[PDB]
Design an enzyme around this catalytic site. Structure first.
Site, PDB file in Angstrom:
ATOM      1  N   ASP A   1       0.698  -1.591   0.223  1.00  0.00           N
ATOM      2  CA  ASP A   1      -0.001   0.272  -0.254  1.00  0.00           C
ATOM      3  C   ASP A   1       0.456   1.568  -0.278  1.00  0.00           C
ATOM      4  OD1 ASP A   1      -1.780   2.059   0.385  1.00  0.00           O
ATOM      5  OD2 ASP A   1      -2.139   1.399   2.462  1.00  0.00           O
TER       6      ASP A   1
ATOM      7  N   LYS B   1       2.092  11.211  -3.828  1.00  0.00           N
ATOM      8  CA  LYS B   1       1.084  10.842  -4.481  1.00  0.00           C
ATOM      9  C   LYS B   1      -0.128  11.604  -4.952  1.00  0.00           C
ATOM     10  CE  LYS B   1      -1.875   6.633  -3.083  1.00  0.00           C
ATOM     11  NZ  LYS B   1      -2.344   5.720  -2.033  1.00  0.00           N
TER      12      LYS B   1
ATOM     13  N   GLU C   1      -6.991   0.259  -4.309  1.00  0.00           N
ATOM     14  CA  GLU C   1      -7.096   0.146  -3.130  1.00  0.00           C
ATOM     15  C   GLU C   1      -8.755  -0.157  -2.010  1.00  0.00           C
ATOM     16  OE1 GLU C   1      -4.320   4.043  -2.562  1.00  0.00           O
ATOM     17  OE2 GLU C   1      -6.272   4.445  -1.398  1.00  0.00           O
TER      18      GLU C   1
ATOM     19  N   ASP D   1     -12.885   4.820   3.910  1.00  0.00           N
ATOM     20  CA  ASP D   1     -11.636   4.768   3.858  1.00  0.00           C
ATOM     21  C   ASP D   1     -11.353   6.110   4.237  1.00  0.00           C
ATOM     22  OD1 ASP D   1      -8.626   4.702   3.481  1.00  0.00           O
ATOM     23  OD2 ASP D   1      -8.728   3.154   1.817  1.00  0.00           O
TER      24      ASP D   1
HETATM   25 MG   LIG Z   1      -4.810   4.255   1.931  1.00  0.00          MG
HETATM   26 NA    NA Z   2      -6.653   8.523  -1.939  1.00  0.00          NA
END
Ligand SMILES: [Mg+2]
Ligand code: NA
Ligand SMILES: [Cl-]
Ligand SMILES: [Mg+2]
Length: 379
Positions: free
Chosen positions: A7, A68, A172, A196
């Site tokens: 991850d 990211k 994810e 999330d």
């Molecule tokens: Mg995450």
């Molecule tokens: Na995200």
């Protein structure tokens, strides 16, 4: 040789491996089962992970994070234009691609986002190799479900730079569902909602699963809502508390503020398991020490609007998926902030008392699922 699951997170990363019939989420050299997605450059060294985050207050212009948010984007993407305004490091344009520009060993150098993420991936690969005792060459790496082709390609390129054969880039929320075994269902559609709430972003996804095939039915959320925003509410509260007590404003001392921020992150974590937390910082400002405490209820008050705000993307995702609450088969928690008892209460209450899948540490679920999938792909 086992393949690994990684991850590659906005704020933290995590790595797992399936072996001897189960997932091992792997602790790094400091004993931490997640590693900051940070790379720092000094006059003498390149630091990655805990060592980079641990010196972010000292070196803000050369300590890179949030790569990211750049990866796979053009320089003129409004996201890049907007996000760059709030980072202390420089972003430059090289042929309409962003690069991060820093000082390293005395010389100005710039790196593509995929080079920075490759450095985090190399750290995660080295954490796995130290545990396994052999070199790792295969990985599954996860990405948000909203990532486009370019963002997927750049993440895959980060992996290849780090020496990994990328078996697959998977979403994810898919990885989180696989962690709970929800891919094993037979014929017949099942609706799964992944909630999330990470360190920097909030993602709600609704997936269908039918005989092991996933379809993304809806995505919603806020790319600028996460645990660090709750930490920020604590920071502002304690800046005011210090002002009232010492008649000094610490808010424009960037080091003091970064150090309070790191202490509020620790306090926030403690408040998920205890009803109060003590916060004690040496030499916060002008040699003044700051020893205080906060309660869980006070923390919840300071964040009450932000916590409530997590339910509208749930409502929006349900609307877009054309589903009622009652049609969701499984609710899966991802992200460290889903440990916060008030956030669990809001979600379970909104779902009229439904169980939450929360037995896998929610900071680790995505890596856990990526590890399972990597082993399937191998096989
Ligand atoms: Mg995450
Ligand atoms: Na995200
Ligand atoms: Cl480490
Ligand atoms: Mg995040």
């Amino acid at each position: 040789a086992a393949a690994i699951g990684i991850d590659l997170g906005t704020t933290y990363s995590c790595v797992g491996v399936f072996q001897h019939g189960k997932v091992e989420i792997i602790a790094n050299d400091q004993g931490n089962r997640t590693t900051p997605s940070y790379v720092a450059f000094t006059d003498t060294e390149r630091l990655i992970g805990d060592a980079a985050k641990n010196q972010v207050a000292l070196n803000p212009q050369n300590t890179v994070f949030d790569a990211k948010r750049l990866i796979g984007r053009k320089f003129g993407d409004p996201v890049v234009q907007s996000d760059m305004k709030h980072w202390p490091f420089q972003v430059i344009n090289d042929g309409d691609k962003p690069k991060v520009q820093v000082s390293y060993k005395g010389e100005t150098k710039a790196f593509y986002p995929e080079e920075i993420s490759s450095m985090v991936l190399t750290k995660m690969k080295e954490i796995a190799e130290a545990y396994l005792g052999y070199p790792v060459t295969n990985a599954v790496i996860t990405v948000p479900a909203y990532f486009n082709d370019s963002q997927r390609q750049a993440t895959k390129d980060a992996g290849v730079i780090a020496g990994l054969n990328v078996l697959r880039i998977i979403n994810e929320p898919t990885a989180a569902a696989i962690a709970y075994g929800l891919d094993r269902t037979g014929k017949g559609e099942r609706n799964v909602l992944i909630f999330d709430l990470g360190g920097g972003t909030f993602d709600v996804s609704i997936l269908t699963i039918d005989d092991g095939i996933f379809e993304v039915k809806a995505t919603a959320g806020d790319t600028h809502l996460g645990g660090e925003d709750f930490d920020n509410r604590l920071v502002n509260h304690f800046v005011e508390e210090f002002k009232r007590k010492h008649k000094k404003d610490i808010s424009q001392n960037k080091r003091a503020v970064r150090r309070l921020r790191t202490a509020c992150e620790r306090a926030k974590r403690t408040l998920s398991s205890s009803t109060q937390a003590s916060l004690e910082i040496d030499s916060l400002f002008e040699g003044i020490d700051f020893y205080t405490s906060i309660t869980r209820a006070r923390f919840e008050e300071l964040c009450s609007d932000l916590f409530r705000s997590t339910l509208e993307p749930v409502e929006k995702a349900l609307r877009d998926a054309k589903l009622d609450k009652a049609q969701i088969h499984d609710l899966v928690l991802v992200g460290g902030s889903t440990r916060i008892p008030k956030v669990q209460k809001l979600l379970q209450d909104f779902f009229n008392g439904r169980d939450l899948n929360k037995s896998i540490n929610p900071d680790e679920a995505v890596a856990y699922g990526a590890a399972v999938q990597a082993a399937i792909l191998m096989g």
